[PDB]
Amino acid sequence: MSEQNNTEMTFQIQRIYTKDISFEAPNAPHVFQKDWQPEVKLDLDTASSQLADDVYEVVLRVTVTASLGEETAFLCEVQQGGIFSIAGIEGTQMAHCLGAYCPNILFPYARECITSMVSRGTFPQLNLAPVNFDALFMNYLQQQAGEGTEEHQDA
Amino acid sequence: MSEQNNTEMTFQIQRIYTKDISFEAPNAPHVFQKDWQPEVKLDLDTASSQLADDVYEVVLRVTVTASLGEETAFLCEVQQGGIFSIAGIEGTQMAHCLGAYCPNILFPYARECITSMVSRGTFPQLNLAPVNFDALFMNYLQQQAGEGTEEHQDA
Amino acid sequence: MSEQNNTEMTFQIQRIYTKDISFEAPNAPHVFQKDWQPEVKLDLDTASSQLADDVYEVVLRVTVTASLGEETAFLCEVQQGGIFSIAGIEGTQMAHCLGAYCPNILFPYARECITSMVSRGTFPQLNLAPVNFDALFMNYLQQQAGEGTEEHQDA
Amino acid sequence: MSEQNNTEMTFQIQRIYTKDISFEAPNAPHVFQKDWQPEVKLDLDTASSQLADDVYEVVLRVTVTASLGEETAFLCEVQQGGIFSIAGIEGTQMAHCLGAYCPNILFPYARECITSMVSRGTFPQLNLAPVNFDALFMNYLQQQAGEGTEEHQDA
Amino acid sequence: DKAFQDKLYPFTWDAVRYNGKLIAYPIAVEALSLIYNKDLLP
Amino acid sequence: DKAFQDKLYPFTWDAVRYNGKLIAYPIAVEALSLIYNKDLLP
Numbered sequence A, B, C, D: 001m002s003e004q005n006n007t008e009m010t011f012q013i014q015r016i017y018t019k020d021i022s023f024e025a026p027n028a029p030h031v032f033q034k035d036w037q038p039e040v041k042l043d044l045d046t047a048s049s050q051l052a053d054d055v056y057e058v059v060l061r062v063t064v065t066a067s068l069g070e071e072t073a074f075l076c077e078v079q080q081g082g083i084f085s086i087a088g089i090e091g092t093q094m095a096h097c098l099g100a101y102c103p104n105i106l107f108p109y110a111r112e113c114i115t116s117m118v119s120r121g122t123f124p125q126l127n128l129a130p131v132n133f134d135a136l137f138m139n140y141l142q143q144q145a146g147e148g149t150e151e152h153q154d155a
Numbered sequence E, F: 001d002k003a004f005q006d007k008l009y010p011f012t013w014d015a016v017r018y019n020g021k022l023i024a025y026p027i028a029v030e031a032l033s034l035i036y037n038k039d040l041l042p
Helices: A092-120 A136-140 B028-032 B092-120 B133-140 C092-120 C133-140 D091-120 D133-141
Strands: A010-024 A039-052 A055-067 A072-087 B010-024 B039-052 B055-068 B071-087 C010-024 C039-052 C055-068 C071-087 D013-024 D039-047 D050-052 D055-068 D071-084
Touching: A010 A092, A010 B028, A010 B092, A039 A092, A055 A092, A072 A092, A072 B028, A092 B010, A092 B092, A092 C092, A092 D091, B010 B092, B028 B071, B039 B071, B039 B092, B055 B092, B071 B092, B092 B133, B092 C092, B092 D091, C010 C055, C010 C092, C010 D091, C055 C092, C071 C092, C092 C133, C092 D013, C092 D091, D013 D091, D039 D091, D055 D091, D071 D091, D091 D133
Parallel strands: none
Antiparallel strands: A010 A072, A010 B010, A039 A055, A055 A072, B010 B071, B039 B055, B055 B071, C010 C071, C010 D013, C039 C055, C055 C071, D013 D071, D039 D055, D050 D055, D055 D071
């Protein structure tokens, strides 16, 4: 293992934590006379700020709209933050990290924080299925090898 | 306006829900660099909403303006609403029940909503001490030199 | 029937914390074959312990079972413990504190923590209705009839 | 032996969730007495299981032990299981699918499900270190001095 | 008389005799769809 | 066995390697002090 190549990337989790959380339910008593068939409009964003050398914070924003039209269920945004060490890669490879990988780390925390807020407003909980733009390149780029075989036992 | 002294009244807890939530950590990794316990400013507000005849919602706005030194630590606000079947009672006794007792029922839920967001932002666990608004209101009657204005209206 | 001798007393919350969590989905990859509302059976439990003089710790345990048809859906359970401190009260006034008042503090946390584990299993919300531990404490011993808090004025 | 990228493979992320969760703090009040420096022990495990015709659920057992010698602070375990309908690849890439890629899909969500329980128990945040299951396997396989960047394609 | 043995712990509370098992307030909130108008990510 | 088996999922993984801890700055937090007074009116 001659680790002379940056394909591994020197990545480190310093700290993960919500910067901002918010929930709005204008029609919160209306839920009794509102039909539970709102169309979930998901929306996503990611940001970056250099705090120090190789130290980049990523702000993964998720915004969930739930509304039948004007008869709105709720609005719920969680701005998740994460202090990350991003070293070894630069520029376009770094743009793949803080634009896809690092917010994908932050998204489970944001998801659960939203779905808790849904339950607090006492609406139907709905968990958003994984979307990996980061892993999509691994899904695309096939390696080379395929044939395994040979295992069984040593004894 | 009426005194109203009768226990034949009805009072049931229908549903607790957050109509509004907020948590804002503006200098979130910066106050992390400050090893100290942040000063907690407690802000408190109330609201009410008539949903039907003898059915009344009340909102409790528990707000935490936390700051360490010359700078914010973390911000929080939860407008914790809850519906109560308030029958057999109106006048100053309704202004007492809906303005003291019903917010007191909402206060454990207000605290919990804040506690969770603070632990998500990885700030130190926040447990506001239980406040009985009723006992304070008893003394309030004999503590009036004059005047007397309030506001309770939410959608 | 009350006889609850009112005193100035002194109360304190030292620490609130989740002691224990369980979420078991034995039918996890089988649950998508189950299309109805799950038959949910909740259980409420308490286990108390005195840490010191004037200082006790009561644990509020909420169990949840669910099943569709004649087969399991999901299982979940939370144990919200809390260290509390008391002075002034005694006998029935003390029994009422650990018997009703402290479960009222702990319930929002235990409740929402179950529904937060629901988020993790990707299925519809299971949020618990507000349980009247106080009325239940009365239904344990029929009617409040205690009396206490005696003036032992010695010098 | 490289350019044999045929449309044989089929992989879909059907569901990613917790099959099982556990958080046990037997010394939850008792942590106030001890020193706040436990030993962060991380446990990793992966399994696959054919539910249907080439549909296998891969479960990740992550377990976080925190003990300063014999005196345990707390224990966390999250069986982050996910259903994946995979086929059309064999041997090395098949073993690398369910053994590397699939637990690496489960690992951000496992990380979070632990971290959130920890903070509810009034314990300091525990972030799981990113284990490059995919990259380290292919490294050791023969690419110990190799580097494979990905072409940033639109669609 | 001061029986210094009883102290401020004459009751434990180890039950919560809840014989009225329910799920929530009588109203079905368990209904929501329209998640992912498209398929999964391949 | 001693002749033909070869699982769909073998996965040797005889190369297990990870750091362990990542915590460095131990900020004294746990439970927020200086919160409220010792009032707590009943």
